[PDB]
Amino acid sequence: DIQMTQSPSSLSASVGDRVTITCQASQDINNYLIWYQQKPGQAPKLLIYDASTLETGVPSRFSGSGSGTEFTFTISSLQPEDLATYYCQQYDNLPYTFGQGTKLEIKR
Amino acid sequence: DIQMTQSPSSLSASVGDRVTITCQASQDINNYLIWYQQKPGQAPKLLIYDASTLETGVPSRFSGSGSGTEFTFTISSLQPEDLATYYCQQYDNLPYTFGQGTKLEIKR
């Protein structure tokens, strides 16, 4: 099965700060990677898919770029509403796993 | 977009009590449905995939059956650690949505 390794374990960014998260798949999934934002209390929201493309409604602050194994998630500008746990999931091969490794916090 | 509707909105069951959940897809997904359980503290864990196929390490107490639009998830015997938020997600057509329409509670 494909492992979703997300790094770093946790990084904190203040409102206005730039965030870069990296998710690595165990096996290359071509480009089929999805990014979600997990807020405690609600289900995770699909934020980015196809390792690059933003879903309709997703702010331009988020950007994803990657392919196969390396996936880079970047928040160009942290906003208070963007505070959550982040993860990546691959839909190329079953079973599907969500990245368990990245927590986003706000500095200050 | 395929909207995943899980029902009922919330139900409580006691350890040993049966739980019947149903997830309905907006549009057919053949059988490409996955069930996850989100236990407080951890990321969503895949419990059942391809609608009816049990993940390795999943007791037969949990069962899922259905196709396309109607998917049924039944817990034959509620367990203490298996108290969680249940949801369903489809990977047939983007965007992929989680059907977060069900919250599980334990009676007593």
Q: Which of B42, B55, B87 sits opposite A43 (nearest CB)?
A: B87
Domain containing B75 equals 1-108
Residue B2 per-residue DSSP state:
-
Residue B60 per-residue DSSP state:
T
- The CA–CA distances, whole Å, from B35 to A7, A13, A74, B4, B80 equal 26, 33, 28, 11, 18
The nearest CA of chain A is from the CA of B19 a distance in Å of: 20
Nearest CA in chain B to A102: B43
Instruction: Give the HSE-up count for residue A86: Cα atoms under 13 Å, Cβ half-sphere.
Output: 30
Confirm if B107 and B13 have CB atoms less than 8 A apart: yes
Q: Which of B42, B46, B97 sits opposite A95 (nearest CB)?
A: B46
Q: What is the CATH number of the domain that holds A34?
A: 2.60.40.10
What is the rounded CA–CA span in Å between residue B105 and residue B107? 6
- List CB contacts (< 8 A) between B98 and chain A: 43-44
Size of interface A-B (CB pairs under 8 A): 37
Domain count, chain A: 1
Q: What was the experiment behind these coordinates?
A: NMR
Q: Are residues A96 and B49, on separate chains, in Cβ contact within 8 Å?
A: yes
- The tokens 């746990």 sit on which residue? A85
What is the rounded CA–CA span in Å between residue B71 and residue B33? 8
- List CB contacts (< 8 A) between B96 and chain A: 34, 46, 49, 91
